[PDB]
Amino acid sequence: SLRAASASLILGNRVAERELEVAYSCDGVRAEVIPRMRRVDLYLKHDSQSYKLEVLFEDINECFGCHLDGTGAILLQLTYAPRIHIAIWVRALDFTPNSSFGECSTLVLKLSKGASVSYILESLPFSGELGELAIASNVVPLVDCPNGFSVPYEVLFRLNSLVHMGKLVARHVNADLFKVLEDLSIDTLRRIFEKMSKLKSTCYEPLQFIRHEAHSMNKLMRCYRIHITPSKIYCLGPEEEVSNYVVKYHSEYASDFARVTFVDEDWSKLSPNALSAKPLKTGLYHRILSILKEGFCIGPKKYEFLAFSASQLRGNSVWMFASNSSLTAENIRRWMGHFEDIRSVSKCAARMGQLFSSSRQTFEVSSYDVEVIPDIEVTTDGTKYIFSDGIGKISTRFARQVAKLIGLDPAHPPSAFQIRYGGYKGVITIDPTSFFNLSLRPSMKKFESKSTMLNITNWSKSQPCYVNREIISLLSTLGIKDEVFESMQQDDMHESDGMLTNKEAALSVLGKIGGGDTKTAADMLLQGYEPSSEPYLLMILKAHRANRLTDIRTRCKIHVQKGRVLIGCLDETCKLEYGQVYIRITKNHKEQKYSEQPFFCNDDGKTAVIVGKVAITKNPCLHPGDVRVLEAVYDPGLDARGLIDCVVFPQRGERPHPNECSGGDLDGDLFFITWDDKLIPAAVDAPMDYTATRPRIMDHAVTLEEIQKHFVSYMINDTLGAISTAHLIHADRDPLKARSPECVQLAALHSMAVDFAKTGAPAEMPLALRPREFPDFMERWERPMYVSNGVLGKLYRAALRHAAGPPSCVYDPDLEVAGFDEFLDAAEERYEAYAERLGALMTYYSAEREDEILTGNIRNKLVYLRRDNKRYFEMKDRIIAAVDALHAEVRGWLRACKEDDASRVASAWYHVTYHPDRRGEKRFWSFPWIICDTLLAIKAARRC
Numbered sequence: 001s002l003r004a005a006s007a008s009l010i011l012g013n014r015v016a017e018r019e020l021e022v023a024y025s026c027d028g029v030r031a032e033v034i035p036r037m038r039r040v041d042l043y044l045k046h047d048s049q050s051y052k053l054e055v056l057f058e059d060i061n062e063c064f065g066c067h068l069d070g071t072g073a074i075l076l077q078l079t080y081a082p083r084i085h086i087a088i089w090v091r092a093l094d095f096t097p098n099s100s101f102g103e104c105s106t107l108v109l110k111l112s113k114g115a116s117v118s119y120i121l122e123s124l125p126f127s128g129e130l131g132e133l134a135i136a137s138n139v140v141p142l143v144d145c146p147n148g149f150s151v152p153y154e155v156l157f158r159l160n161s162l163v164h165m166g167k168l169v170a171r172h173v174n175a176d177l178f179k180v181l182e183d184l185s186i187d188t189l190r191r192i193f194e195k196m197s198k199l200k201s202t203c204y205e206p207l208q209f210i211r212h213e214a215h216s217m218n219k220l221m222r223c224y225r226i227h228i229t230p231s232k233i234y235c236l237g238p239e240e241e242v243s244n245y246v247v248k249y250h251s252e253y254a255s256d257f258a259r260v261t262f263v264d265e266d267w268s269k270l271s272p273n274a275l276s277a278k279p280l281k282t283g284l285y286h287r288i289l290s291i292l293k294e295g296f297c298i299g300p301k302k303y304e305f306l307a308f309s310a311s312q313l314r315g316n317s318v319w320m321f322a323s324n325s326s327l328t329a330e331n332i333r334r335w336m337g338h339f340e341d342i343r344s345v346s347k348c349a350a351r352m353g354q355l356f357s358s359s360r361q362t363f364e365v366s367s368y369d370v371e372v373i374p375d376i377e378v379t380t381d382g383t384k385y386i387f388s389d390g391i392g393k394i395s396t397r398f399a400r401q402v403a404k405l406i407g408l409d410p411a412h413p414p415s416a417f418q419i420r421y422g423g424y425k426g427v428i429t430i431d432p433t434s435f436f437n438l439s440l441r442p443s444m445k446k447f448e449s450k451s452t453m454l455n456i457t458n459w460s461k462s463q464p465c466y467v468n469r470e471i472i473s474l475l476s477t478l479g480i481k482d483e484v485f486e487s488m489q490q491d492d493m494h495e496s497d498g499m500l501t502n503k504e505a506a507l508s509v510l511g512k513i514g515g516g517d518t519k520t521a522a523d524m525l526l527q528g529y530e531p532s533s534e535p536y537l538l539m540i541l542k543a544h545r546a547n548r549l550t551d552i553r554t555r556c557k558i559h560v561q562k563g564r565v566l567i568g569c570l571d572e573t574c575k576l577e578y579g580q581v582y583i584r585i586t587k588n589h590k591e592q593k594y595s596e597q598p599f600f601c602n603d604d605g606k607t608a609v610i611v612g613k614v615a616i617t618k619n620p621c622l623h624p625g626d627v628r629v630l631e632a633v634y635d636p637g638l639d640a641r642g643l644i645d646c647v648v649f650p651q652r653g654e655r656p657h658p659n660e661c662s663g664g665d666l667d668g669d670l671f672f673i674t675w676d677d678k679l680i681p682a683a684v685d686a687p688m689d690y691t692a693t694r695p696r697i698m699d700h701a702v703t704l705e706e707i708q709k710h711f712v713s714y715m716i717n718d719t720l721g722a723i724s725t726a727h728l729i730h731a732d733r734d735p736l737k738a739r740s741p742e743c744v745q746l747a748a749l750h751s752m753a754v755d756f757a758k759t760g761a762p763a764e765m766p767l768a769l770r771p772r773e774f775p776d777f778m779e780r781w782e783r784p785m786y787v788s789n790g791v792l793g794k795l796y797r798a799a800l801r802h803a804a805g806p807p808s809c810v811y812d813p814d815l816e817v818a819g820f821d822e823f824l825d826a827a828e829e830r831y832e833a834y835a836e837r838l839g840a841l842m843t844y845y846s847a848e849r850e851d852e853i854l855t856g857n858i859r860n861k862l863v864y865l866r867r868d869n870k871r872y873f874e875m876k877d878r879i880i881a882a883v884d885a886l887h888a889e890v891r892g893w894l895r896a897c898k899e900d901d902a903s904r905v906a907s908a909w910y911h912v913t914y915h916p917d918r919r920g921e922k923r924f925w926s927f928p929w930i931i932c933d934t935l936l937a938i939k940a941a942r943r944c
Contacts, residue, residue: 018132067131337449390667418668422449563674578653625685817907
């Protein structure tokens with residue numbers, strides 16, 4: 001099964017299908033193919049040092065058997081560069097003199113003497129045979145425009161991205177190519193590339209292609225993403241994302257902005273092991289740092305480090321700027337505010353990061369309109385707590401205005417907002433009595449800034465309730481019995497299976513999900529459509545039920561009907577004291593129908609108040625008694641003040657309850673609240689004791705250097721994942737569950753680790769506690785396993801067990817407006833439009849089915865997205881957002897039409913996308929239904 005062979009390694013690039021060009025060669029290469037590990041280990045010696053090379057099957061784009069100068073050889077074309085290790089087996093960067101592992105994609109193994117390639121091939125992914133000969137010749141590989149020509153930056157960037165992806169050879173990218181580009185038109189030019197990108201293999205005749213389909217010449221901001229790989233860089237074609245304040249304000253220099261992320265060869269999150277061994281600094285660590293300090297250069301832009309968001313640090317990403325005469329990075333920093341007078345490098349980086357959070361711009365607010373009010377502290381037993389930590393208030397009027405500006409309902413605005421206003425970060429909650437538009441507090445101010453632009457990062461919405469493994473663990477520790485989680489899950493799965501064979505079920509499950517598709521489909525169902533008869537409906541229902549069940553099995557994301565996930569708002573009135581909270585909520589699909597329930601008291605006829613006991617906690621929670629049980633009460637005042645869809649905490653007491661839950665801060669964090677009798681714990685463990693984490697002070701004002709070193713240090717010393725993993729494991733197996741000292745010990749480290757990003761205090765994981773045996777549920781395939789006795793395992797296996805022509809397209813005549821036929825040719829125009837534009841969005845995000853790009857759930861996850869959940873979810877956010885913008889543009893195309901005129905127009909649309917004869921090979925259902933509002937309406941009008 002395992003295969004071994006001796007060869008000489010050749011490194012280069014195919015120029016035509018069968019001509020290779022060498023940039024490196026080495027002899028004495030020992031080669032191992034290990035099908036079980038799905039990896040190809042190459043053992044090599046170069047100079048006087050011995051190196052190991054790792055190639056994964058997932059890396060290999062194309063495999064070939066070949067004839068090279070009298071012997072048989074194997075050709076690999078590689079999507080991602082091989083990983084490299086040095087013997088001291090420690091990872092290292094390109095070692096070749098000319099950075100050839102960076103420069104070239106294609107790699108050859110030249111076997112010698114009696115080699116049957118086929119013997120080697122046998123245990124490799126599909127192969128093909130071509131037999132033919134070759135010819136010989138900071139951050140790399142890159143291309144540059146020749147001295148003569150001018151092409152807009154986005155073009156050069158795209159060309160690169162294509163070369164990196166392996167689509168286009170570098171050498172072909174010459175003066176011959178560029179003039180075609182220059183006569184070439186930017187909108188089209190990009191359009192050409194997208195179709196160039198969908199190619200299976202490398203294109204060795206670009207000019208022909210480009211000129212061929214050029215002859216057949218048939219909001220959001222572009223963002224320039226960049227991956228610095230150990231041996232490689234990758235340009236990611238400018239993708240339309242939601243912006244943030246800093247980049248949006250400098251719109252004239254938007255092109256000069258770039259997003260750099262430091263990853264491994266297949267864009268995997270860099271294991272801290274790659275940057276340490278008595279730990280020994282590796283070489284990769286020195287590279288990332290070096291890039292931060294020196295910067296790297298593409299085309300006319302030479303980038304310099306600028307800043308990194310709070311979240312970007314966790315994402316190992318960073319904001320970089322291409323300084324010019326008109327504007328330099330530092331100018332942007334000083335423009336942001338005054339960081340001369342903070343003394344901790346860590347929070348330095350953080351406050352430089354604040355303004356970069358993705359947000360929506362609103363109203364510039366004057367100083368006199370802004371009210372600075374005291375903080376509501378308290379001191380208990382030698383420890384001082386802040387109730388008002390991170391939270392302020394906003395006028396009702398101004399709240400309506402802000403709400404309207406960000407596309408929400410002015411009549412009914414969000415009760416709370418999460419904002420960046422100059423140096424203020426945090427939450428402002430509506431105060432009807434408040435005279436001032438804003439009423440900020442010292443808690444929220446982090447630095448002085450000239451900026452008076454109010455930016456909203458988030459707002460209060462009543463998100464449906466879900467548990468997860470962290471919460472479930474603690475609940476079971478606190479006496480909550482396995483059978484209620486089992487029941488909860490069984491209910492959730494059945495409903496989820498439900499969607500396909502029941503209208504009510506479908507409506508409910510779509511109720512617990514927030515997307516354009518959810519309400520589109522809900523509205524469609526409510527008019528009487530069903531999956532069998534209607535393709536789009538079936539599409540969505542299947543997709544969502546699939547992702548839903550996957551969520552249940554993988555993450556233990558199980559629906560809790562009685563409860564919600566809300567944002568914390570403070571009780572300004574102070575008529576509320578410790579041990580109580582006040583919750584008023586917008587009634588969901590089900591509560592509406594059976595509203596007379598014990599937990600609910602006051603009923604507003606469409607909203608109601610919680611009265612029972614409630615259990616509350618915040619993610620992440622590793623300590624028992626991060627779960628707090630409080631009494632929900634009715635206060636007439638707060639009823640009158642109109643606060644809704646948030647949980648209102650006491651202003652009074654020995655300790656503020658947010659602080660009792662994990663971190664306990666009011667800066668836009670979300671609490672899990674349930675009033676399900678079956679989930680509240682009988683008695684609660686004492687809250688965690690206060691942290692004693694001190695940042696300290698230094699003489700120097702903060703260097704850039706320190707900021708960069710802090711960033712990398714975070715790379716090396718992160719342990720949130722490892723601790724969370726090990727803690728969950730121990731909580732599952734050990735008798736004491738979450739209390740077992742191993743779990744207490746571990747949980748203590750977690751606080752230090754979350755504290756780490758901003759205090760610079762490492763959390764150190766004892767080698768002993770790191771586990772070599774992983775549980776059934778965690779699905780760590782590559783490592784040893786144990787069937788688990790705990791409830792996480794019971795749930796896992798229940799879920800796994802649950803997993804154990806009707807489709808049709810019936811054109812609905814009813815959906816036929818009379819004058820239609822008028823615009824079908826026109827429709828064909830813009831359907832087609834929509835159809836390739838989605839198509840682009842599909843290829844970029846490696847979406848392949850309509851489901852994936854409308855839902856945002858990629859069913860086939862690429863290698864780097866699978867275990868790093870956060871960045872995949874960021875990608876889901878960005879996919880959904882981009883698609884939403886597109887749909888806005890399409891609802892758009894309707895807007896144009898004569899108000900009398902349009903309605904007919906859609907019907908045309910519907911028909912062009914649903915008639916058997918007029919749509920022949922079109923592969924999309926999405927399109928007409930962007931206009932369900934217009935269509936469903938017309939339907940209703942006939943149906944009686």
